[PDB]
Design a protein around this ligand. Structure first.
Ligand SMILES: *[C@@H]1O[C@H](CO)[C@@H](O)[C@H](O)[C@H]1NC(C)=O
Ligand SMILES: *[C@@H]1O[C@H](CO)[C@@H](O)[C@H](O)[C@H]1NC(C)=O
Lengths: 190, 181
């Protein structure tokens, strides 16, 4: 019933510059060993009940010309490996869509609860702000979430705002997505 | 600023006894089919890149080392120390906001999945239903997994969809319900 991971994370900034690199073996959810480019070898970690196992794992991995030389080179691979598509990824965006509607009251007594539906965007970074008659409205029950992933390589989230209907009032949800300079808006009147 | 490309390879006993998942900022780029011995794009947009790379020699070694630990290490301590189990959580929601009669897609989002072994079934008032897409497990930061299962459908006022996750064959199920708003 056990599980093992041979994880290798590659961190890079925009353009395509490698910034960090690791290789780590981990049995069960406990972590065993990670490479250390300083020492040049695969060094153990989590000296738990499995401290013993840790030493071994690394030794074995250490006595492998290929692996060590694979790791050593690492960062240089990271570039080539990612390069062909890195531009696409770092610069691929899907603009969000917004729709405002009213929904059954969550927390609070106000007779109307507005819900701003922002969906279909990438990356996940986005900011929602509300406006009452062109006026910014500070947060009080303005509870959102943290952009839910769809796995569809898109994201969505929702913003709530409680209020009292007075004709002539216009509410607008403003959304600025890091993938579009054009802030999106959706208004709602009683 | 920064971005994270993760190449997680894992092995276990059961369901997919071996898998590879390569992500970027947590969204899966492509997994890897060990039968045809090739990468599989999460989106057609990708395809071309899953094509090349020829890093096969690493995968080969990683794979072996993994299977190796499952072979030797496991038996040694099977029943000697505790299994990290993660009680899975399922949530259900729509891709686009709700518009009765207009086409939509339900999403069953599974989180805290550990180990990555499961089966997802959708129902509608207990009435089972198919047309669901394959459930894709993906590795996630912190040595864990998450999976999604999509099901297109046309939302109607008296609907009641349920997404049933069945963890580790027969030990622990999770049922998430979705009703119209
Ligand atoms: C990414 O994190 C910070 C913030 O952008 C950055 O300075 C750093 O180079 C990256 N992380 C590592 C471990 O290099
Ligand atoms: C849902 O609709 C889209 C577009 O028609 C289609 O690509 C997809 O295959 C349908 N169903 C599933 C389960 O993906």
């Amino acid at each position: 019933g056990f599980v093992a991971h041979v994880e290798s994370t590659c961190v890079l900034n925009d353009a395509g510059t490698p910034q960090d690199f690791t290789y780590c073996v981990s049995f069960n959810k406990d972590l065993l060993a990670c490479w250390d480019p300083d020492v040049g070898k695969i060094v153990p970690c989590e000296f738990g009940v499995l401290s013993r196992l840790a030493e071994i794992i690394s030794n074995i991995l250490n006595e492998q010309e290929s692996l060590i030389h694979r790791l050593q080179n690492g960062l240089q691979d990271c570039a080539t490996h990612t390069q062909p598509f890195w531009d696409v990824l770092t610069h691929r965006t899907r603009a969000p869509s917004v729709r405002v509607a009213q929904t059954t009251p969550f927390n609070t007594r106000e007779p109307v609860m507005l819900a701003c539906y922002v969906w279909g965007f990438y990356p996940a970074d986005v900011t929602i702000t509300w406006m009452k008659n062109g006026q910014l409205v500070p947060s009080h029950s303005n509870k959102e979430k943290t952009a839910q992933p769809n796995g569809d390589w898109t994201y969505q989230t929702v913003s709530y705002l409680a209020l009292t209907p007075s004709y002539g009032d216009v509410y607008t949800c403003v959304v600025q997505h890091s993938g579009t300079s054009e802030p999106i808006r959706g208004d709602w009147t009683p | 600023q920064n971005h994270t490309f993760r190449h997680t390879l894992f092995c276990q006993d059961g369901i997919p006894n071996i898998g590879l998942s390569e992500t970027y900022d947590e969204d899966e780029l492509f997994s890897f089919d060990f039968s045809q011995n090739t990468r599989v794009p999460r989106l057609p947009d990708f395809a071309e890149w899953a094509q090349g790379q020829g890093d096969a020699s690493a995968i080969a070694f990683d794979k072996s080392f993994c299977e190796m630990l499952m072979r030797e290490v496991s038996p040694k301590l099977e029943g000697q120390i505790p299994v990290s189990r993660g009680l899975p959580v399922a949530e259900v929601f729509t891709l686009k906001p709700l518009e009765f009669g207009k086409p939509n897609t339900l999403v069953c989002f599974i989180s805290n999945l550990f180990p990555p072994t499961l089966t997802v079934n959708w129902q509608l008032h207990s009435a089972p239903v198919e047309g669901a897409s394959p459930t894709s497990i993906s590795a996630v930061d912190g040595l864990t997994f998450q999976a999604f299962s999509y099901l297109n459908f046309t939302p109607e006022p008296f609907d009641l969809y349920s997404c049933t996750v069945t963890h580790e064959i027969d030990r622990y199920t999770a049922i998430a319900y979705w009703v119209p708003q």
